[PDB]
Design a protein around this ligand. Sequence first.
Ligand SMILES: [Zn+2]
Ligand SMILES: [Zn+2]
Lengths: 71, 104, 66, 47
Amino acid sequence: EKERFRKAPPNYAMKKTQLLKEKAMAEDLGDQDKAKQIQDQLNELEERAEALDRQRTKNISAISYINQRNR
Amino acid sequence: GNDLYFVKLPNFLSVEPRPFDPQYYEDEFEEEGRTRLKLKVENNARIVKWSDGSMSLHLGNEVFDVYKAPLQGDHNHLFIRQGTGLQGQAVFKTKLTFRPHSTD
Amino acid sequence: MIIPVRCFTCGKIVGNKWEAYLGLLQAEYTEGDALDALGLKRYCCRRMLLAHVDLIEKLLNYAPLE
Amino acid sequence: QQPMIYICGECHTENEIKSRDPIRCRECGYRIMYKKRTKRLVVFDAR
Ligand SMILES: [Zn+2]
Ligand SMILES: [Zn+2]
């Protein structure tokens, strides 16, 4: 009942959700389920990447810049 | 005009030997089925030459970076052998020596 | 894990110079000129920023929540 | 009247676990969970 109205991607269930969605898409021989899972996974990946880049936007982006510049 | 334009694509990027025409195409194919329909929809081609010297394949929104390997082990004289003359009237266009291997 | 507050051998404060060193290397500085600009003359203090590996950036990738 | 509060893992949500209870998170399902910091006095003579 708690998971019903509470969004799955909040907050640490992202990667586990990605793996579970990939398994669900793979386990289905129907094309509609595969396409829906692909779209959902793409949206979740985009959101998670944006969230991770926002968190690493400061103090980690700088050192990545200077590491690429170092090498 | 007469320049080597030889490319060697893998099984999952097999392009049609003829231009895409509505009278030569049909619907026969359907994670399991996602790699099946990609054979006859994404596979006309424009090999872009960049400033670094390398090339890439442009068959849609996705770009596959290719390398024109100059392999001197198969010095085959590629020719357009269409049947009009005595037997396969091969036209001497270019000898295939460099194989470009595309990949994702 | 994190930049030491003081040079082990000297006692000179190098805790406020890791980020500045990283900035100077974000510029086109040669790795020695950054230390020279940061006022690090002794080689004992220079090794603090030369050899330091910042792992606290890798440990912060394991977010407890969010 | 302290219910021995734990912190979940994947969730990080405080859960009230008394004795004779299954160790699971109140939400989303988790069999791993840790304990909260003590309330005892933590004092370091920095040296
Ligand atoms: Zn020193
Ligand atoms: Zn649980």
